[PDB]
Structures are given as C-alpha cells and as structure tokens.
Design a protein around this nucleic acid. Sequence first.
RNA 1: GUGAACGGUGGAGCAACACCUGAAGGAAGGCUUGAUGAGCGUGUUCCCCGCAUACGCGGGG
Length: 73
Amino acid sequence: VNLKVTIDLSNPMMEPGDLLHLDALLGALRVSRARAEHGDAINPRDYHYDLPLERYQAPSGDWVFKASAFKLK
RNA sequence: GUGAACGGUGGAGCAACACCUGAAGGAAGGCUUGAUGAGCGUGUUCCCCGCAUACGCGGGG
C-alpha cells in the first residue's frame, strides 16, 4: 500500500540517540497486544515480528522490515 | 520486543541594622432687619367678546 505515517505528540520526548524505527514501535505494540490477549507470560520474540509490514530480503539472508526510522521535523 | 527497559535535583541558609516631614505662616477687611403691604372719591343703562342661534345666559371697560 506504500504508506507514510506521521505522529504528533503533546508531551516532548527523549531525543533518540540511535534510530527510532517504526518497525520497532510496531513490534512493541504487537508485543503489548499479545500480552493483552495471551497473558503476561509470553515470549516477546514470538510476536515482535508479527507485523503488518512487508519484509525486504538482502541477497545473503539478512531480512529487515520495510519500515523506516522516524524523521523529526 | 518504541538503543528500550531502570533512575528524586537534592539537602542547609534571617534582608537587616540606623534614621524626628516640617521649620515658618492673622480668616480677613467692609454691611440698620428693618422696610413694604392691612383706613380715607364716585349713584344708573351705554361701546367691544363668546355660547348660542337670539327665549337669553355668561365678562368685560
């Protein structure tokens, strides 16, 4: 669908020292959703890749999510 | 699995001490509470104004 997501925030945030990836945020949200459904006793690494996101495959393994790091205006 | 997750800007501290708003400055100078109003003349049909609508009422000099 090739979409762009923007976020405005009332409180200021910590300026991220390294890249604040969208797939990281979506993975943490999916982990929180899985904790909401399947209880707190879950492996977070089972569901942190269960994202509404396509995956880019490098020529030698090394798949990444199709998200990007959050740019700041 | 948001390079995350976890993390108290805290504890103590006198604004205060001294310091006269007031020294001098005229409410004065002129001025009837007594005046005014409270008593003394005309001797009989004649001009104007309204209501009417003339049978007379009212007023006026």
